[PDB]
Amino acid sequence: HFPLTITNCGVDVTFDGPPERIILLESAPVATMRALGVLDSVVLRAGAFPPEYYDAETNAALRAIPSLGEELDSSGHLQISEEVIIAQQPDLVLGLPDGVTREGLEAVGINVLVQPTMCPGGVGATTFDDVYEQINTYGRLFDRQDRAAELVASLRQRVAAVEKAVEKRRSAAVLYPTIGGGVGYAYGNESMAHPQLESAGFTNVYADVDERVFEVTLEDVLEQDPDVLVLLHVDGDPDAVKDAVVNLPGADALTAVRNDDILVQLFNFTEPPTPLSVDGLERIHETFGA
Numbered sequence: 001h002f003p004l005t006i007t008n009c010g011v012d013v014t015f016d017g018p019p020e021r022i023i024l025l026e027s028a029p030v031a032t033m034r035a036l037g038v039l040d041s042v043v044l045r046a047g048a049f050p051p052e053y054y055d056a057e058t059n060a061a062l063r064a065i066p067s068l069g070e071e072l073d074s075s076g077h078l079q080i081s082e083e084v085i086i087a088q089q090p091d092l093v094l095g096l097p098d099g100v101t102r103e104g105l106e107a108v109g110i111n112v113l114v115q116p117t118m119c120p121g122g123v124g125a126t127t128f129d130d131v132y133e134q135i136n137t138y139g140r141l142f143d144r145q146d147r148a149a150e151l152v153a154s155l156r157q158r159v160a161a162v163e164k165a166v167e168k169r170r171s172a173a174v175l176y177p178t179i180g181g182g183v184g185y186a187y188g189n190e191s192m193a194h195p196q197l198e199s200a201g202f203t204n205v206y207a208d209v210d211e212r213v214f215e216v217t218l219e220d221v222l223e224q225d226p227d228v229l230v231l232l233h234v235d236g237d238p239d240a241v242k243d244a245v246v247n248l249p250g251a252d253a254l255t256a257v258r259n260d261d262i263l264v265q266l267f268n269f270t271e272p273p274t275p276l277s278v279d280g281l282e283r284i285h286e287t288f289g290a
């Protein structure tokens with residue numbers, strides 16, 4: 001049903017038909033778009049698109065989608081200007097990098113969508129329903145509702161299988177380390193990390209933090225001393241990601257470090273809510289067992 005309105009971070013974003021000139025400023029949408037078969041709607045991309053996320057054909061498609069840049073900062077944030085984006089005359093931009101504003105894009109007729117749990121301000125505790133609701137939204141946006149419904153059903157079944165196995169409690173945290181040294185950031189109950197950990201049978205040590213992601217010191221993580229750690233990174237060498245934690249002075253005081261109960265995985269296997277979050281759930285479950 002078009003015209004379609006999507007409410008996004010409080011804003012009504014209206015589409016008279018499916019978008020045809022999309023710029024991807026984040027990798028999250030690709031997990032759903034490749035299943036719906038709508039990658040031809042993407043004209044440009046920016047940032048990292050790890051091939052580990054995708055099937056071979058999708059990776060070949062991405063190599064043929066030109067890039068507006070790949071420079072990330074130490075927190076994995078894309079560096080790109082609003083003027084560069086506007087110059088391409090897109091009809092839809094997915095993601096808002098630092099310093100790129102919804103208002104600036106909307107002012108010249110460009111629609112903007114952000115992943116709902118990355119809206120500024122409170123978004124409430126995240127669940128696997130946030131994966132499914134976003135897939136159903138993409139189903140409407142691209143007029144692929146039947147395909148979206150089949151994707152949701154397949155994912156729900158896989159999540160149910162992990163939760164059943166678990167039904168037949170260790171603590172955990174998910175972090176985003178700083179390369180060169182530092183535990184960096186942790187994920188609270190607005191992150192996809194939170195329901196991922198809980199569905200895998202863990203207690204999230206930051207379950208009571210009503211934030212998505214927040215800075216932590218080693219001392220902070222030590223006070224929680226989670227049995228297990230998951231370390232995320234947008235790209236680059238996972239050895240350096242683990243070293244950013246385990247080679248810190250005093251880090252051997254961590255149970256997870258002593259027992260080597262540490263999983264390093266690429267960002268979208270946890271955050272934000274996408275089909276890849278279900279892959280991540282399975283990975284955590286198979287790695288640390290139940």
Ligand SMILES: N[C@@H](CCC(=O)O)C(=O)O
Binds near residue numbers: 213234
């Ligand atoms: N790119 C990571 C780093 C944390 C941050 O945004 O500061 C995230 O979005 O979760």
Ligand SMILES: [Mn+2]
Binds near residue numbers: 075076077
């Ligand atoms: Mn970030």
